C-alpha cells in the first residue's frame, strides 16, 4: 500500500527508476486496489489488426472534430497524410509496419480519443525523440487534456514542474508524494 490520492481533473506524475514499481502501481489502480472509466496507454505500443482510424476511435462512434484535434495533438497529421490510403491504412495483417514512435503516437491518440474518467499513460514518450515528446506533452497532456484526471508515468523534471502532484517511487515504496514546490525543498 502507497499513500497518495487521485484528484479529479489533475495531473499526477508517477516518477522513479527502472524497477521502482511504476507499471505495477498503474495495475493496482486499474485493479481497484489503489489508491483508497479507464483509458490506458501501455509503455510498449498496442495495435489491433485494422486501420489507423479503427485503432484510434477503438469501437466508439466517430466524431470528425474530436478525431482531428487528437491527431493534431499527438503529432499524427504528417504521418497519416504520407500514406496513400491515409487513415484507412491497414495495420497488423502482415502489410504495413509502422515505427515504434508511430505506434506509440497511435496508442496515445487511442487513449486520449476515449471518453474516460481516468487516463493512465505509462511512459508514452519512451520511444519518441525529445522534440516530439515536448510538442505532445504540451499540446496533448497539458492543453487538450487540461481538466481530465491524468496519471502520467514520467521522471522528467520538465514534466514534474507541470504536474499538480508528484509520486516518486523507490523499490515498490513511495519516497515522496506532493507538489513540485515541496519536491524542490529537497534538492
Amino acid at each position: 500500500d502507497i499513500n497518495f490520492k487521485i484528484e479529479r481533473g489533475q495531473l499526477l506524475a508517477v516518477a522513479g527508476s527502472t524497477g521502482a514499481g511504476k507499471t505495477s502501481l498503474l495495475m493496482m489502480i486499474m485493479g481497484e486496489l489503489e489508491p483508497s472509466r479507464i483509458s490506458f496507454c501501455p509503455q510498449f505500443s498496442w495495435i489491433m489488426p485494422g486501420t489507423i482510424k479503427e485503432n484510434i476511435i477503438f469501437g466508439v462512434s466517430y466524431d470528425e472534430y474530436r478525431y482531428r484535434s487528437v491527431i493534431k495533438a499527438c503529432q499524427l497529421e504528417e504521418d497519416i497524410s504520407k500514406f496513400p490510403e491515409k487513415d484507412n491504412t491497414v495495420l497488423g495483417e502482415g502489410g504495413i509496419t509502422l515505427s515504434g514512435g508511430q505506434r506509440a503516437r497511435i496508442s496515445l491518440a487511442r487513449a486520449v480519443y476515449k471518453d474516460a474518467d481516468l487516463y493512465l499513460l505509462d511512459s508514452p514518450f519512451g520511444y519518441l525523440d525529445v522534440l516530439t515528446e515536448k510538442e505532445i506533452f504540451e499540446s496533448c497532456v497539458c492543453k487538450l487534456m487540461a481538466n481530465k484526471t491524468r496519471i502520467l508515468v514520467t521522471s522528467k523534471m520538465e514534466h514534474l514542474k507541470k504536474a499538480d502532484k508528484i509520486l516518486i517511487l523507490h523499490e515498490g515504496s513511495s519516497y515522496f508524494y506532493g507538489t513540485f514546490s515541496e519536491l524542490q525543498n529537497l534538492q
Epitope: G16, S17, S123, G126, Y127, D129, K156, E158
Partner: nanobody
Framework: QVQLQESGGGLEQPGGSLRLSCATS????????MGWYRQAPGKQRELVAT???????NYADFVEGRFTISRDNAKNTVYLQMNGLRPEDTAVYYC???????????????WGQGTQVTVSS
Amino acid sequence: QVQLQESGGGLEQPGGSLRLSCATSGVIFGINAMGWYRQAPGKQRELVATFTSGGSTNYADFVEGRFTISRDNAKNTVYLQMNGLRPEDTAVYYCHATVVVSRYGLTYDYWGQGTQVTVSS
C-alpha cells in the same frame, strides 16, 4: 554542473564523411537517452538520430542508412558517424542527453552548444 561538448564538425564535400563526438562532464548518476539533432539557418530543430529511453535507436527519414549513432556508457559519450554527406545536411548539429540528476531516477534534458557541419561543392 552538467555540460555537453560537441566536436568533429567541419567543412566537407558532397559524398564526404564526418564523425561527431559529444563529451559530457559533471555527470553524478547516469545518462539515459542520448542523441543528435540539427537546425539549418531559418529552419526548425529536427531529430537526426537518437537513443530512445527504451534503449532502441530512432533515425530521421532523411538519414537513409547513411548515419550511425554509437554510445560509450563508461565515458558517457555519444557519436554520429556520417557518410554520403549531401548539401542538405548543412546545419548546426546539437547533442542531447537526458541526465539522471537524482538518486531516485529523476532527469533533466541537456543540450550542447552545437557544432557546424557544412557540406559544399
